[PDB]
Design a protein around this ligand. Structure first.
Ligand code: SF4
Ligand code: SF4
Lengths: 383, 379
């Protein structure tokens, strides 16, 4: 007929009404669709039910309804850069190339505070607004190391926002320094820490965590360090590593613990699915999941995580097509390090490239501030 | 895969670029898609090639690109009413229930009594069409136009086709130019698009044997255009004609528009086999209706508007047509509340139909300027 074409042509609100009026839709899926229409929270069991039963089309109707209700077409990005203090690590995560079981200390490097400051100064005449600091955990890079770096960075470039380190790092540094998590985070904030990134969550459930990330900080510890950051007024993000050896209920359990923490302390801005990759780690024969599973996962994340403003995708972590399609399955925040530089003396994402990627799937490219206000609306900007 | 989903998700410009970069698309279809990207006219044989070869998806990419280039999301409708002077006719069209080979007649007083029923309605146009009969002659219609303009000067009169004008001017011994000039002076403002059927003699001699021919139809529009009148054009499709007859029809309109420029809208009219002498001719599919809208948009590069009547076709078809080249949706709006009561399209119903396919409902006036932009209204 033209039935599929007509459904595809409907506005977001009409699509959800059409699903709710479909006599053939199983009752479980109608009840969940009705919750979404009413901005009601879905349960753990409903989350599992979506992962086990829901088709991509259905999930896109719900997730996109939420994404447009919260953000309209806005698709946010900012101008950041990275410093990696070390590319080796004391811990043994089976999905990570820096695991002490696959990479000896001699096969990598550990920056000094001087070296980190030399990297930071390369960006002095760049319109970056924040630096992201993440990497391995090593004994020389302790409380004094990081606090000295934050103080030197703020002395040199006061206006540069520092988004640095995960609870995996903070648990290790605060245990050795004999500070409580609160007093440790307070000390780092005073030194110049502004916010935290979302890494190190992996999967919370011990059934999975004991297998893939057995020796670094546990879920209670990870959530506790975010709780203390939130009590100090800091913003943070949260991740979930998916599509490896976990079961769908392990994903919903993960998201449930995050959702309860957000209801307690309110400090998370973005939820960030991280797709497992089977290259250069101890999990080389674990198959990666399909683009369809990536998109069902973004959608279910959008539906489940009702108290997180943003769902973030990293353009360098997924294909161009997956990143663009994700903007229709719940994603409103697209991230990575923008690179307008030209190689001299001879795959970067320029601002023009990213703006065109976003406009190609009918979305509105927004350069944001740290609280997701509009700094530049690129929608009618021509280059 | 997500290949189909990815294509469906692209903006208008990017979907056209995606077709042009498709290695498996036939060369001939890539060449036409490139002409559309370059705003280059497609030729008669390219038009026939699209009817004979092109798939709906492809044709939606090209037609929607043109439609959005010209109009963006604008979807136009006006506020009009109809008078039907007679449902009897002297002619023999095999697709028409009024054919003499298978009734009432209004007086000028009767037509004026109908017009006066709309005195308190904000209608911008009256549309007048129907059968051709000898009592409804030049003198009859000029009397009506003068009475209508005297009663309601700002009511635009969009009245009668060349089928009617050819008959009344031949009887009055006026040239087409002098007759249209006379009717304009009496109060005619514009002509609707009917009576075009299919121009090619191979088809027209069979389906509309007695009424004016293509030359006479085009000439009466030409005289209208020279007098500053805007007019529309139709094409009756989906009956016994071949696709090349449709392209021939469009080509004659396209050439006439290049010459005189007075056409505003091109209006495909779907053949129906109910209550006529073509009652065994099979009707074409909704997909063929949408391919036909799309090819009309691509071919008719010098027509501003492609129009669908919401009543001619399903709700669903009219909505889909807005994505296959249609910018202009027509019919008689009815916002009246029935009092003393024991289907009709309201403005609200039409606005909801347009917004449901992500388009901008513009209630427009005779100059295609805004009366109300319903994209800025919440009911
Ligand atoms: S703790 Fe972080 S860097 Fe170290 S092995 Fe695990 S994931 Fe890699
Ligand atoms: S001239 Fe018009 S009204 Fe008369 S039979 Fe033909 S189509 Fe019908």
């Amino acid at each position: 007929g033209t039935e599929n074409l007509y459904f595809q042509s409907m506005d977001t609100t009409s699509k959800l009404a059409l699903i709710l009026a479909d006599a053939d839709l199983p009752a479980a899926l109608k009840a969940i669709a009705l919750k979404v229409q009413n901005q009601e929270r879905i349960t753990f069991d409903e989350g599992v039910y979506l992962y086990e039963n829901a088709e991509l089309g259905y999930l896109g109707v719900l997730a996109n309804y939420i994404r447009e209700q919260k953000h309209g077409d806005n698709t946010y990005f900012n101008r950041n850069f990275h410093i990696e203090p070390t590319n080796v690590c004391v811990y043994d995560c089976k999905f990570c190339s820096y695991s002490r079981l696959i990479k000896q200390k001699e096969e990598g490097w550990e920056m000094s505070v001087d070296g980190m400051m030399e990297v930071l100064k390369k960006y002095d005449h760049e319109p970056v607004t924040e630096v992201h600091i993440t990497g391995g955990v090593v004994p020389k890079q302790n409380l004094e190391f990081y606090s000295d770096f934050f103080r030197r960075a703020k002395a040199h470039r006061p206006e540069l926002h520092i988004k640095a380190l995960t609870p995996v790092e903070y648990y290790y540094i605060f245990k050795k320094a004999k500070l409580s998590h609160y007093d440790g985070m307070k000390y780092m904030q005073e030194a110049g820490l502004d916010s935290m990134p979302g890494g190190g969550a992996e999967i919370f459930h011990p059934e999975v965590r004991e297998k893939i990330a057995h020796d670094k900080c546990n879920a209670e510890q990870w959530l506790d360090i975010h709780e203390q950051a939130h009590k100090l007024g800091m913003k943070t993000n949260a991740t979930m590593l998916y599509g490896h050896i976990e079961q769908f209920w392990h994903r919903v359990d993960h998201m449930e613990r995050l959702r309860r923490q957000q209801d307690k302390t309110g400090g998370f801005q973005a939820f960030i699915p991280l797709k497992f990759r089977n290259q250069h780690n101890q999990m080389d024969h674990v198959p990666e999941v399909s683009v369809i599973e990536d998109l069902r996962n973004y959608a279910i994340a959008r539906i489940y995580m009702d108290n997180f403003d943003h769902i973030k995708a990293y353009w360098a972590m997924i294909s161009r097509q997956t990143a663009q399609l994700s903007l229709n399955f719940g994603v409103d925040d697209i991230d990575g390090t923008l690179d307008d530089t030209t190689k001299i003396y001879s795959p970067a994402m320029s601002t023009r490239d990213l703006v065109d990627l976003i406009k190609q799937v009918k979305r509105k490219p927004i350069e944001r501030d740290t609280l997701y206000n509009v700094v530049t609306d690129y929608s009618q900007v021509t280059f």
